[PDB]
Ligand binder design. Structure first.
Ligand SMILES: C=C(C)CCOP(=O)(O)OP(=O)(O)O
Ligand SMILES: C=C(C)CCOP(=O)(O)OP(=O)(O)O
Ligand SMILES: [Mg+2]
Lengths: 195, 328
């Protein structure tokens, strides 16, 4: 009713902090797109810039369109500019976006080594990080893990080094209050960064 | 105290262990031993005592693992990230390390008897020169033991370890041992500090913290994550026991997942290979019904096997070389 956009932005602004980049990892292999879509739009409504969606069986990758279909639907209730903003803010991932991509980059650096363009020594941490960036997309600060499995199951191993990992038993009927509860958890977390 | 704390499990420990050992048991557990400072505060004790207590718990915990027949243990003792702490603290931590690694020599009897191999994984060059030498001797002294493996991650991060591993295979390229098209999942595995070890079945973090803090990111991607609120110096057998119980609950699903991922990788490899064999044969002219593609596949494979095996023996060389040089 549009007092719902003001509410959800107020909810976000109210937390000590919000994730710039949220990951949604689904581990459940028993069986569902509207729930995931609801999570995504909630993320966008509260003020989270980027949302990754991941499953280890690549089901979401193979169903990108059907997923973006629901996201755009659910999103309007609560066309081309709207389709561009979801493509930018939402990434759909499978395992190949993790380790395989690190191999991918490794190769891209070893040709520059063959080319006598780069020396092995030029590859500090930070260079690898760059070779492994998108554009705006930072590392996910918060991953919401759904389902019975205590594992990231291949989710962005490189980028997930400081990500707070919050576990929820299922995504099946997920409520806003349940989603926000996770956000309150993340907002209250202490990050020392080695000090 | 010593490094090896000989102790027999108690009655209930023993009994619960027997029941648990009937199911799948982890072969390799890794620990982020976090919360020593919060512990020292809680105990109204000095920071350094907190860390010392932390080392005592490690010794106790390894005995638990050995008593459960878990032959490999990786710990996070010191992160590169940790250098940013007050000189007071890091000097203290550095001094602790000197003490423990120095005491290790005086324990050679127990190390042989118990058969404990100690490896120290990290960017060790960042440590004080005296410490490097100390560690190096410790490593050389135990290198031939086989009954129990302890990996201490010191001056370590995951990113550093990963970068290092790619650098190593870029070194292979520059040294003309590696051609870009040979860099893969396996090869990267084999250039990590952890290359002698299988990936950890369980990763445990002791604070109430729900982050990995740049620890074994590559190795623990498919492993059982257990976050327990207990501060490390207060860890108990039962905490450990709860970890293993989690592992057992997850085992079936994580196995299915690990095989799926393996089967999909062999597939995507036999795919990207068979395709390389195509461009060559189309650009050549001939294209099969007399096992032509099949023979070009055996070739590309054996090329890799021979050339990667070659890169590897030269990497092991370079590691031993720096080990001998700095531990003389
Ligand atoms: C050697 C260990 C156990 C390092 C854990 O790091 P921290 O305790 O410094 O990690 P943060 O909480 O600051 O990320
Ligand atoms: C060398 C390390 C990082 C040991 C882990 O405990 P801490 O020193 O991080 O103590 P906490 O701040 O986590 O309580
Ligand atoms: Mg800490």
């Amino acid at each position: 009713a549009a007092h719902h956009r003001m509410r959800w932005r107020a909810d976000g602004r109210s937390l000590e902090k919000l994730p710039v980049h949220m990951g949604l990892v689904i581990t459940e292999v028993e069986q569902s797109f509207s729930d995931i879509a609801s999570l995504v739009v909630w993320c966008m409504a509260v003020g989270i810039s980027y949302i990754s969606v991941y499953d280890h069986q690549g089901i979401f990758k193979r169903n990108n369109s059907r997923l973006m279909d629901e996201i755009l639907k659910q999103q309007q209730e609560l066309k081309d500019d709207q389709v561009l903003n979801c493509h930018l803010a939402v990434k759909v991932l499978s395992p190949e976006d993790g380790k395989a991509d690190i191999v991918r980059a490794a190769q891209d650096f070893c040709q520059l080594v063959a080319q006598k363009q780069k020396r092995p020594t030029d590859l500090d941490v930070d260079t690898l990080a760059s070779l492994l960036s998108s554009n705006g997309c930072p590392d996910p600060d918060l991953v919401l893990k759904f389902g019975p499995v205590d594992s990231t199951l291949g989710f962005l191993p490189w980028h997930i080094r400081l990500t707070e990992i919050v576990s929820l038993p299922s995504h099946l009927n997920i409520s806003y209050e349940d989603f926000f509860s996770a956000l309150r958890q993340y907002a209250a977390c202490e990050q020392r960064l080695g000090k | 105290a010593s490094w090896i704390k000989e102790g027999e499990l108690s009655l209930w420990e023993r009994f619960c262990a027997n029941i648990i050992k009937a199911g799948p048991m982890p072969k390799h557990i890794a620990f982020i031993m976090d919360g020593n400072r919060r512990y020292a505060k809680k105990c109204q004790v000095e920071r350094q005592e907190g860390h010392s207590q932390g080392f005592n718990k490690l010794a106790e915990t390894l005995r638990w693992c050995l008593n459960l027949g878990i032959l490999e243990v990786t710990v996070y003792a010191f992160s590169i990230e940790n250098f940013k702490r007050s000189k007071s603290e890091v000097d203290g931590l550095m001094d602790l390390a000197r003490q423990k690694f120095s005491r290790l020599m005086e324990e050679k009897e127990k190390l042989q008897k118990h058969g404990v191999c100690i490896r120290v994984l990290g960017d060790l060059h960042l440590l004080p020169l005296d410490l490097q030498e100390l560690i190096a001797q410790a490593v050389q002294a135990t290198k031939n033991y086989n009954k129990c493996f302890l990996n201490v991650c010191f001056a370590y991060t995951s990113r550093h370890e990963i970068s290092n591993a790619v650098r190593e295979m870029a070194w292979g390229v520059e040294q003309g041992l590696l051609d870009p098209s040979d860099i893969s999942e396996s090869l990267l595995d084999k250039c990590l500090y952890t290359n002698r070890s299988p990936h950890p079945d369980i990763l445990i973090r002791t604070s109430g913290e729900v982050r990995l803090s740049d620890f074994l990111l590559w190795q623990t991607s498919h492993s059982c994550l257990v976050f327990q609120p207990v501060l490390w110096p207060e860890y108990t057998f039962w905490n450990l026991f709860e970890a293993i119980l989690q592992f057992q609950m997850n085992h079936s699903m994580l196995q299915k997942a690990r095989d799926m991922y393996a089967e999909e990788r062999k597939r995507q490899q036999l795919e990207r290979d068979q395709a390389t064999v195509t461009e060559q044969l189309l650009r050549e002219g001939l294209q099969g019904d007399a096992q032509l593609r099949r023979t070009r596949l055996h070739k590309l494979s054996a090329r890799r096997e021979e050339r990667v095996q070659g890169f590897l023996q030269a990497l092991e060389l370079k590691r031993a070389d720096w080990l001998a040089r700095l531990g003389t």
